[PDB]
Amino acid sequence: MNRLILAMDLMNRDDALRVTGEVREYIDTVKIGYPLVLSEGMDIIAEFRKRFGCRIIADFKVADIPETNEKICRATFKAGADAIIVHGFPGADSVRACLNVAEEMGREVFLLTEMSHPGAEMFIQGAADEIARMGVDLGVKNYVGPSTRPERLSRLREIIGQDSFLISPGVGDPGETLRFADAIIVGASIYLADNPAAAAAGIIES
Amino acid sequence: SRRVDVMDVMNRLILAMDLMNRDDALRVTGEVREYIDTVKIGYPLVLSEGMDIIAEFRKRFGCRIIADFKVADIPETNEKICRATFKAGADAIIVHGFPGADSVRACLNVAEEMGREVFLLTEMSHPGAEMFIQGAADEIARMGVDLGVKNYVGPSTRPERLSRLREIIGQDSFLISPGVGDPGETLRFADAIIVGASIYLADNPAAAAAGIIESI
Numbered sequence: 001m002n003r004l005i006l007a008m009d010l011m012n013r014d015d016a017l018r019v020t021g022e023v024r025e026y027i028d029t030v031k032i033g034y035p036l037v038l039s040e041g042m043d044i045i046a047e048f049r050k051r052f053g054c055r056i057i058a059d060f061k062v063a064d065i066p067e068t069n070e071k072i073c074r075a076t077f078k079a080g081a082d083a084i085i086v087h088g089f090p091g092a093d094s095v096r097a098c099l100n101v102a103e104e105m106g107r108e109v110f111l112l113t114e115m116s117h118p119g120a121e122m123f124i125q126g127a128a129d130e131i132a133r134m135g136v137d138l139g140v141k142n143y144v145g146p147s148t149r150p151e152r153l154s155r156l157r158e159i160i161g162q163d164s165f166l167i168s169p170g171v172g173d174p175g176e177t178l179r180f181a182d183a184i185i186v187g188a189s190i191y192l193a194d195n196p197a198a199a200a201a202g203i204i205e206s
Numbered sequence: 207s208r209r210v211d212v213m214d215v216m217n218r219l220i221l222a223m224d225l226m227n228r229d230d231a232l233r234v235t236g237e238v239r240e241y242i243d244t245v246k247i248g249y250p251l252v253l254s255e256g257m258d259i260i261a262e263f264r265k266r267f268g269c270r271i272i273a274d275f276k277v278a279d280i281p282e283t284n285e286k287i288c289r290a291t292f293k294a295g296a297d298a299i300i301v302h303g304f305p306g307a308d309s310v311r312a313c314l315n316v317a318e319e320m321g322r323e324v325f326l327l328t329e330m331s332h333p334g335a336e337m338f339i340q341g342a343a344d345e346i347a348r349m350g351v352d353l354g355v356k357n358y359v360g361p362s363t364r365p366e367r368l369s370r371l372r373e374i375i376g377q378d379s380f381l382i383s384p385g386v387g388d389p390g391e392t393l394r395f396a397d398a399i400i401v402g403a404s405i406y407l408a409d410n411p412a413a414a415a416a417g418i419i420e421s422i
């Protein structure tokens with residue numbers, strides 16, 4: 001919806017439920033990560049799904065060995081998550097382990113190629129194109145890129161093709177980002193704003 | 207005492223508790239407490255039973271707890287994850303070094319504010335680690351040293367790489383490693399080895415542990 005995904009990283013149920021309920025008419029997918037889950041419990045995922053009728057992407061940056069990755073994905077889909085975000089840096093077997101569980105449980109995997117923060121240039125950026133092609137080779141259809149580096153985003157989009165689905169987070173220009181990505185992830189700009197719906201609204205009007 | 211600057215975990219053996227149900231996890235851990243005083247708990251157990259399981263292990267077994275959360279997000283998110291983890295009672299947290307120096311400093315900042323420890327993961331043990339991680343491992347380790355990191359995680363599956371990592375971090379740093387490898391040789395470089403399934407899936411957990419320590 002509106003090609004906008006809310007990154008709900010508040011750490012207490014009250015605030016999280018309030019802000020999410022307040023911007024519901026603008027977005028239809030909520031990305032829930034460890035800040036909220038480690039503070040309130042995995043049950044928060046099914047509750048969000050039920051109360052808001054939205055799809056949930058568990059942003060867990062899965063980055064372990066294949067056997068542990070299997071366990072994490074199983075617990076996450078059992079909790080009701082529609083998709084899970086997995087790091088590609090650990091290699092093909094760790095990613096394939098996640099894809100196998102997603103296939104068995106009827107869910108989806110999003111492959112994180114390049115990260116949006118400064119530190120990303122140190123090691124991740126140098127591997128991003130290759131990580132993206134690895135996903136293509138494995139048959140990954142969903143991807144996550146950096147909104148802070150449209151130059152990198154466009155390369156990534158070229159690699160994965162136009163049939164793929166790509167989302168990006170970080171500070172950028174909604175206009176130019178939604179030029180390579182199917183949707184942008186916005187967090188603090190909304191959930192810390194005095195008026196979240198307005199901030200969300202303020203964002204779409206671009 | 208082998209080292210006088212930092213006390214060894216009991217028998218230099220760390221249990222990786224990745225069972226997913228509270229009952230089985232608490233049972234196997236209580237059964238090997240005679241040989242191990244340090245337990246590594248990860249997401250398989252925490253996402254199945256809740257973060258409160260960490261305080262429960264501490265209360266019941268008096269063990270040291272390392273949260274193996276492979277922290278791998280941007281600085282702001284990393285801070286929130288570490289804060290929540292230390293609040294749950296973990297003595298240390300494992301964070302990935304590949305997302306960059308700022309993501310790591312974020313974790314160290316919280317660890318400092320709460321008086322806890324950060325372990326930096328440099329090279330992973332599985333086959334896929336050869337694709338991208340191994341190529342950056344030496345650099346990640348040097349980055350750790352420059353940031354002041356004193357605790358590291360390495361691969362038991364590759365003794366030659368463990369030695370090389372030990373070379374980079376110095377003899378004053380603390381190093382632990384997981385994966386299948388010979389305890390004897392691994393312990394020439396690592397201060398402690400991590401063992402999971404070989405112990406927790408055994409018919410007799412205490413026996414598997416006793417056996418491994420004798421192997422050494």
Ligand SMILES: O=c1cnn([C@@H]2O[C@H](COP(=O)(O)O)[C@@H](O)[C@H]2O)c(=O)[nH]1
Nearest residue numbers: 007115116169170186187188279280283
């Ligand atoms: O490269 C990446 C991958 N993921 N995220 C995540 O997307 C959200 C962005 O939120 P923000 O708009 O408040 O900074 C947060 O949950 C964050 O961990 C990034 O910021 N950058």
Ligand SMILES: O=c1cnn([C@@H]2O[C@H](COP(=O)(O)O)[C@@H](O)[C@H]2O)c(=O)[nH]1
Nearest residue numbers: 064065068222330331384385401402403
């Ligand atoms: O490079 C690494 C980093 N961490 N672990 C973790 O250490 C434990 C090893 O368990 P295992 O002995 O049963 O294979 C598991 O929790 C696993 O996620 C590895 O195996 N390799």
